[PDB]
Amino acid sequence: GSVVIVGRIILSSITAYSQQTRGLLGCIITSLTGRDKNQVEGEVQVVSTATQSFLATCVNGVCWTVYHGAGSKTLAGPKGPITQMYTNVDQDLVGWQAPPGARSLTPCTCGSSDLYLVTRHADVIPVRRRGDSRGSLLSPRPVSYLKGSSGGPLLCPSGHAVGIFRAAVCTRGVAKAVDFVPVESMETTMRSPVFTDNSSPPAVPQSFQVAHLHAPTGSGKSTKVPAAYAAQGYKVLVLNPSVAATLGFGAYMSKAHGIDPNIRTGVRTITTGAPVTYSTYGKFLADGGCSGGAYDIIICDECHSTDSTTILGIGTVLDQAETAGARLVVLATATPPGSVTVPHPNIEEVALSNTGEIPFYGKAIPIEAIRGGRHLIFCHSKKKCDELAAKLSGLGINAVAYYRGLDVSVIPTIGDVVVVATDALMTGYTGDFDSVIDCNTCVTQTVDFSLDPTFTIETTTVPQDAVSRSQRRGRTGRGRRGIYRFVTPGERPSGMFDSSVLCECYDAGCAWYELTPAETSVRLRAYLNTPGLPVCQDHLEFWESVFTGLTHIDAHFLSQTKQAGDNFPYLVAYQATVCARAQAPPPSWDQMWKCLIRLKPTLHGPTPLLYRLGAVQNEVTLTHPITKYIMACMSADLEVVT
Amino acid sequence: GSVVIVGRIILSGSGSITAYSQQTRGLLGCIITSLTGRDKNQVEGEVQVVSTATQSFLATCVNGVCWTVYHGAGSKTLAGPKGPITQMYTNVDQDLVGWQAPPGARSLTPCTCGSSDLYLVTRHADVIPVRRRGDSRGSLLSPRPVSYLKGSSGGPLLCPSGHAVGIFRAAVCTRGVAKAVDFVPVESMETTMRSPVFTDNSSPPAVPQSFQVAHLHAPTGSGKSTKVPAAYAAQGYKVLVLNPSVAATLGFGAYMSKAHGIDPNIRTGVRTITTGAPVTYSTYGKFLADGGCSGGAYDIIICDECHSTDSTTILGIGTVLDQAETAGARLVVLATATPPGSVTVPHPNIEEVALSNTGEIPFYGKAIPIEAIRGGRHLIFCHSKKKCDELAAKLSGLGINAVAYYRGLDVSVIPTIGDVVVVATDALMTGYTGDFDSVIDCNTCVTQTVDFSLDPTFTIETTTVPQDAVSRSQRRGRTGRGRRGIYRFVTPGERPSGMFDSSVLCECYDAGCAWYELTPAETSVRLRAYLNTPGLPVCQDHLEFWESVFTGLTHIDAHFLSQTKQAGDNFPYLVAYQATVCARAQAPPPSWDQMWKCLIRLKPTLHGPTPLLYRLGAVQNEVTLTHPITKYIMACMSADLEVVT
Numbered sequence A: 001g002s003v004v005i006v007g008r009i010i011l012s013s014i015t016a017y018s019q020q021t022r023g024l025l026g027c028i029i030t031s032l033t034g035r036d037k038n039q040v041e042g043e044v045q046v047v048s049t050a051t052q053s054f055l056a057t058c059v060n061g062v063c064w065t066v067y068h069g070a071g072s073k074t075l076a077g078p079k080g081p082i083t084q085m086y087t088n089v090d091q092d093l094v095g096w097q098a099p100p101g102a103r104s105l106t107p108c109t110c111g112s113s114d115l116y117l118v119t120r121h122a123d124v125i126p127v128r129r130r131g132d133s134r135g136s137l138l139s140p141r142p143v144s145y146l147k148g149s150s151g152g153p154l155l156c157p158s159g160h161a162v163g164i165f166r167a168a169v170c171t172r173g174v175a176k177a178v179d180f181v182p183v184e185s186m187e188t189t190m191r192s193p194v195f196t197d198n199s200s201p202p203a204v205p206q207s208f209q210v211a212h213l214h215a216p217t218g219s220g221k222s223t224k225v226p227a228a229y230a231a232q233g234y235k236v237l238v239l240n241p242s243v244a245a246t247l248g249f250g251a252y253m254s255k256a257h258g259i260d261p262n263i264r265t266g267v268r269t270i271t272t273g274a275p276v277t278y279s280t281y282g283k284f285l286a287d288g289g290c291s292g293g294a295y296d297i298i299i300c301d302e303c304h305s306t307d308s309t310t311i312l313g314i315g316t317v318l319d320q321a322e323t324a325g326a327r328l329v330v331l332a333t334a335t336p337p338g339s340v341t342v343p344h345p346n347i348e349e350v351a352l353s354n355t356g357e358i359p360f361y362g363k364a365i366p367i368e369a370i371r372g373g374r375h376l377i378f379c380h381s382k383k384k385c386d387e388l389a390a391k392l393s394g395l396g397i398n399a400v401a402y403y404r405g406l407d408v409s410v411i412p413t414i415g416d417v418v419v420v421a422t423d424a425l426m427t428g429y430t431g432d433f434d435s436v437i438d439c440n441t442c443v444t445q446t447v448d449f450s451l452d453p454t455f456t457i458e459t460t461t462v463p464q465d466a467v468s469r470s471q472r473r474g475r476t477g478r479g480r481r482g483i484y485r486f487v488t489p490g491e492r493p494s495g496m497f498d499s500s501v502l503c504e505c506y507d508a509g510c511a512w513y514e515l516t517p518a519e520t521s522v523r524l525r526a527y528l529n530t531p532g533l534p535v536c537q538d539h540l541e542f543w544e545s546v547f548t549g550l551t552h553i554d555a556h557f558l559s560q561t562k563q564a565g566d567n568f569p570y571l572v573a574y575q576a577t578v579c580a581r582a583q584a585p586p587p588s589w590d591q592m593w594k595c596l597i598r599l600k601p602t603l604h605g606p607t608p609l610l611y612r613l614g615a616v617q618n619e620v621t622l623t624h625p626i627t628k629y630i631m632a633c634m635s636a637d638l639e640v641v642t
Numbered sequence B: 001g002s003v004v005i006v007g008r009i010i011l012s013g014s015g016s017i018t019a020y021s022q023q024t025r026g027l028l029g030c031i032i033t034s035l036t037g038r039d040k041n042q043v044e045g046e047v048q049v050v051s052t053a054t055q056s057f058l059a060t061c062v063n064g065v066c067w068t069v070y071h072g073a074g075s076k077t078l079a080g081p082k083g084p085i086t087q088m089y090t091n092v093d094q095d096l097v098g099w100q101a102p103p104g105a106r107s108l109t110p111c112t113c114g115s116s117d118l119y120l121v122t123r124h125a126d127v128i129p130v131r132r133r134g135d136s137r138g139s140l141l142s143p144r145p146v147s148y149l150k151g152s153s154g155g156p157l158l159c160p161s162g163h164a165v166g167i168f169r170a171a172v173c174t175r176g177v178a179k180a181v182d183f184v185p186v187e188s189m190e191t192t193m194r195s196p197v198f199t200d201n202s203s204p205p206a207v208p209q210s211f212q213v214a215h216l217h218a219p220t221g222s223g224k225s226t227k228v229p230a231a232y233a234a235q236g237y238k239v240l241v242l243n244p245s246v247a248a249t250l251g252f253g254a255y256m257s258k259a260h261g262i263d264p265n266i267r268t269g270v271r272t273i274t275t276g277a278p279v280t281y282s283t284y285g286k287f288l289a290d291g292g293c294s295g296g297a298y299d300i301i302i303c304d305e306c307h308s309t310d311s312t313t314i315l316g317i318g319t320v321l322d323q324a325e326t327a328g329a330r331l332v333v334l335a336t337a338t339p340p341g342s343v344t345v346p347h348p349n350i351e352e353v354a355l356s357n358t359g360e361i362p363f364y365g366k367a368i369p370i371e372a373i374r375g376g377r378h379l380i381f382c383h384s385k386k387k388c389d390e391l392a393a394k395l396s397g398l399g400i401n402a403v404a405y406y407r408g409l410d411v412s413v414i415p416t417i418g419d420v421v422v423v424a425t426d427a428l429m430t431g432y433t434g435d436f437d438s439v440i441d442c443n444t445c446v447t448q449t450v451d452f453s454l455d456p457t458f459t460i461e462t463t464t465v466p467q468d469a470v471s472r473s474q475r476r477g478r479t480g481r482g483r484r485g486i487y488r489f490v491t492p493g494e495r496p497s498g499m500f501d502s503s504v505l506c507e508c509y510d511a512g513c514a515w516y517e518l519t520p521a522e523t524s525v526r527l528r529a530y531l532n533t534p535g536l537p538v539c540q541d542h543l544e545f546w547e548s549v550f551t552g553l554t555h556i557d558a559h560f561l562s563q564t565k566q567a568g569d570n571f572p573y574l575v576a577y578q579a580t581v582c583a584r585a586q587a588p589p590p591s592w593d594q595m596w597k598c599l600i601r602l603k604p605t606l607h608g609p610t611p612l613l614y615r616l617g618a619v620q621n622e623v624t625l626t627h628p629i630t631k632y633i634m635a636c637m638s639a640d641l642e643v644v645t
């Protein structure tokens, strides 16, 4: 679907009124066709997807808005879908060529400290500028007042644009400031190229540089290129988030380029003294990061990956590389932030229908589609993998489930099989398949600053973004004609990750890699500050402050929850420690808290709740000191998407 | 818009109960079908996944009737093969609606055997085990987050043999987790089918020999409050007519003296007369201030505008219903032009014209031409005080005699008389009784709703929502009275009539404490009589909860209460109470909104964090949760609480 214009705020002292020009039916058809024949007027446009509605402000002949709402989408236009002219994911900014009849605001030259934010409801909210991207609302307003107004103009008194609104800065649920994209970030974006070629490795520079490599898996981004570099006489470290891919490079380089390299995973380590090393991000962090002098080039493969280990690992490289004597970091991926899924020559795509013997996410799979051969069916949860493997086995199709927890030996590597897997597949198994069938959804975590009492980590089923869809489809069609069947044809924008991933990085830091919160921050600071990487909201101060107060955890609990492989082993363990000290029962008796099961006779009363990590069945008390500290931490300034 | 079928849930054939979903329509197909009311796609399966524009849920055919919940479907028609099917049963009291099952749609069959191990099917095709605790209740064997169940209302509850016990309609929560489920019994679906499909209420009832509560569903024009009470009086009966509006009450009495003959008793705060006549007109507020029914006085009590869900009206009707048989009345009539489940039908005096973007005056995203409002007397309904004053401002500058009206301002600021454009909120409707040449409607309104947000307690949020069938009808009803009328509107939509929020239950206890010296226990009795009387607007039963909250709010400062009372704002007790607690800790209020003006004078002696009891708006000050009243309220949030899904 395309972004659709559904109305306009007309600007006129500054005042405004809004005008609606479409309803739901129209918005839906227009988004599907990409064809909008309505006459565009005004400088601010009310726009909408099938999900969110928001704004777009025309400046200098470009119509601008936020990446978090528009993604990389085309805008419906008179001739047809308009492709985006600019896409600056780093600045939460995208932009289309202004259609005829649109007026443009001209940039604010002088720069008043006094500024007015136009909202989607046609209000003109005064704002005092505090910095380049920061203004304080004269009247603190609830956060929900500003919702739907991402992409709206901030104006000086004369009516020239100072920037477009991108996020509220909340203090305990009330908006006291605003983050906007400066007009000078737009003029900078208009002066960068629309075509920077990243498909070739850079040549090694005289001094330190970070460089980007965009090219598909198989192209030898991970094999040929490190070899080429080794030939020129350099030492190269290749980081990867999969144990199975890292190990498989070992026997691959030996066969193919006569280099018997160093391999470093948690399960296995080989030192051959080769000039090339392949390691997981995880083993890299276990070994303390960059060793003084050991490497010239550090290639971070699958840098589109937004799990906590990769992020923490990449930001370690970026914080340490130059001081360890690196001259080159290369961030490598086939799917950088802002990518969309384009057709693939080797892959035929066929929507699923309702005609099929096997139900699947409201559609159907025909037995004939998966009876012969090797097939990969992605499902969102383990529960659903178990269900589908059971049905298929019961019809005599040779079927097998794989997800986090299982050994990859459930395999089966040669012969007929239907593999029903979660995304864990993409890290534990390196093989390709005759067809891929994709449910087009994933499970994700989201933090919610719910103040009940502190924060919550919700697990939610969500639509897949452009990176998931591409990575899943790319398990077929690798040098051999593949089919890709799907339940649904859309895809969310790529390259954004949630604040809970940040939280996960402190947790793993503390739990797994002996990092203080201060230390975790510095490495995340290096990641955030590097252009072209995935993006998130800057909630570092906040998570640092939270984990900073979580002291004298109980070793036994920590170990146990690490060994069960829970998410957030540190937060779970820490809550467990507080409970067992306070002589109080845990939030519930979910598996999550099994680590406390032998104290169940003696633990009684209300749970000293620190935060919410699932359903809380027990009564709660807010009197524990750690709770009060975490409550106090919620007064910090939180950027929120609006 | 119609309800559209967009998928189904196929139950298994044998062995253990299991199911899977089939999706038959996307969003685009769903909207088109809803707007045309036409659905040529055939219908298999007994459990349909159904949607509206705004939401989606389930329906379960049993005995040839496709049943769903009223809170989901309202009174809407079902998209069918030869166009929209109208509802056959609309049992608002039971949260139960029903269409005739379309061609070859298959139907579950009722729990013949009667077991107590149950299985709930959800929209995801999951199959939760449930233990029957009562006629209409069941506990989850493994409790669950209430969000798991969203979108499954309408879904069936099966016994092991595959037979339908009931349909899911609500989660019973404790602090965010669903311990239980409420469903509509299958035998409520048979009580429903075993009755007339059409019941009449168009005529005033005959006076029964013994106590009976009747409904009078009739236009404001049939003379619900003049003719019908005169007629009863003409036959020698003592009649009390209650009404929410002081203006309407005085008007009826004045009309009765000049028209139907006699000089009735009037009872309002601003005016009271005891003539000794046998008709008495009163407001619900004066009636409650007077302590309700005093025995022997009346044979018939007409509760006019019984569709109103302001707190006084509900608290009023609840009193009459608790007290009237024991006070010797023979008849309680519940009168309204717009009863629960009613739809806005067309009016022969009234031309209904969609606003467009063509026009000089912006109006909620559309536009009004000045042509349409210079020629005569017109009424513009706006949602806020703000928009009202803003739009007076614009119109008058354009050479129009416009005046704002809302709560606080004085009626008769409306010229009587002149040639006018009055810009008003719904306050118009209880403030002023005149009609107009045309009504212009924004089709939205401000309402309050409660959020059990546990942060630390609950939150009363004010929001703007689309108007319901009752709102549209009453607003439009201010033109086309006798003469010709024109109704112009921004949106054609209309939410289901007859449902009110738990926050309205909150205001009842609040008003009982602030205005009518009713302990919470006494308020619960009165509210209970209301919930239990059929054919009145419906709510979720949060009575124990709210009673328990207000029972803790003891020793309020009289002085603050009297100010929040006079200032006329919502929830004077909760506001006075929070301010009371704030003043006794020498702490500030949650913010300095106008809500808290009673504490401005103490500003310089108030310091530290606010001991927050509950959220009635933005909280700007830092908060402490250690006050004993906060803790007492936190304990109250462990009540069993019905919530919809």
Ligand SMILES: CC[C@@H]([NH2+][C@@H](C)CC(N)=O)c1ccc(Cl)c(Oc2ccccc2)c1F
Pocket: A067, A068, A089, A090, A091, A092, A093, A496, A497, A498, A527, A528, A529, A530, A534, A535, A536, A537, A538, A641
């Ligand atoms: C413009 C700020 C930028 N964040 C900085 C910390 C830079 C960085 N390394 O991410 C940013 C860019 C793009 C988007 Cl969609 C942003 O907002 C969100 C919102 C929700 C999820 C993820 C990002 C954003 F916050």
Ligand SMILES: CC[C@@H]([NH2+][C@@H](C)CC(N)=O)c1ccc(Cl)c(Oc2ccccc2)c1F
Pocket: B070, B071, B092, B093, B094, B095, B499, B500, B501, B530, B531, B532, B533, B537, B538, B539, B540, B541, B644
């Ligand atoms: C079947 C329960 C019934 N409530 C009882 C207290 C009876 C009564 N007098 O209301 C009921 C009927 C209809 C509906 Cl839409 C119900 O659910 C809601 C949901 C949200 C708002 C209002 C009512 C309901 F809860």
